[PDB]
């Protein structure tokens, strides 16, 4: 319905390594909890297995081809097309495969740019700021617990108009 991407990627758009996040950043976890609370998270199967259980107080939706999939607290879908029937604010939550499938369909993106270069094996698709308006850009606060510089972006797809 209202369709957003929600993602953390590094300076080279790495989002993951060995089915885990490359970095430890509690503030971003806090950012995710705040944004998606009361809403819906759609994620691919590997992302779900990585987390290992549903996130509380959210509708959790998992896209998989596995007809045997029936986890407590999770709604299953089997097609991309299923996503557009989900009501409310829906966040595309990962991973790489779902980002690639959805980045041209979403209204907007909440991206946490991790200002570092990590070793990765999964990536967020390339995108241009030519196409995305910076609705907001907020530096994350560093401290003892959060030690990689990072920036919370809210990007909104630009309309194509005649010049």
Ligand X SMILES: CCCc1nc(N)nc(N)c1Cc1cc(/C=C/C(=O)N2N=Cc3ccccc3[C@@H]2C=C(C)C)c(OC)c(OC)c1
List Cβ neighbours of 136 (8 Å cut-off, separation of 6 or more).
152, 153, 154
- Side-chain-side CA neighbours of 87 within 13 Å: the count stands at 0
Q: Is the dihedral of CA 87, 56, 42, 22 positive or negative?
A: positive
Binding to ligand NAP by CB under 6 A, coded x per residue (else -) over 54-83, reads ---------xxxx-----------xxx---
44 binds ligand NAP (CB under 6 A): yes
Tell me whether residue 101 or residue 157 sits nearer to ligand NAP (CB atom). 101
Q: Do strands 40-44 and 59-63 pair parallel, antiparallel, or not at all (unpaired)?
A: parallel
The option from ligand X, ligand NAP, none interacting with 64 (CB < 5 to 8 A, set by class) reads: ligand NAP
Of the candidates 154, 152, 123, the residue with the CA atom closest to the CA atom of residue 30: 152
Q: Which residues bind ligand X (CB under 6 A)?
A: 6-8, 21, 28-29, 32-33, 47, 50-51, 55-58, 93-94, 112
Q: How far is the CB of 125 from ligand X (least distance, A)?
A: 14
Asked whether 125 and 14 are in contact (CB, 8 A), the reply is: no
Q: Which residues bind ligand NAP (CB under 6 A)?
A: 7-9, 15-16, 19-21, 43-47, 50, 63-66, 78-80, 93-98, 101, 122
- Binding-site residues for substrate, in ranges, read 6-7, 28, 50, 58, 93
């Amino acid at each position: 319905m209202t369709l957003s991407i929600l993602v953390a990627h590094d300076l080279q758009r790495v989002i993951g390594f060995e089915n885990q996040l490359p970095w430890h950043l509690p503030n971003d976890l806090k950012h995710v909890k705040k944004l998606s609370t009361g809403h819906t998270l759609v994620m691919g199967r590997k992302t779900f297995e990585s987390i290992g259980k549903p996130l509380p107080n959210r509708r959790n939706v998992v896209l998989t081809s596995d007809t045997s999939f029936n986890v407590e607290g999770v709604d299953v879908i089997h097609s991309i097309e299923d996503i557009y029937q989900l009501p409310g604010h829906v966040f595309i939550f990962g991973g790489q495969t779902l980002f690639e499938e959805m980045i041209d369909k979403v209204d907007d993106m909440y991206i946490t740019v991790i200002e570092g270069k990590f070793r990765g094996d999964t990536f967020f698709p390339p995108y241009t700021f030519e196409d995305w308006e910076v609705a907001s850009s907020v530096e994350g606060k560093l401290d003892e617990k959060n030690t990689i510089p990072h920036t919370f972006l809210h990007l909104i797809r630009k309309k194509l108009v005649p010049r």
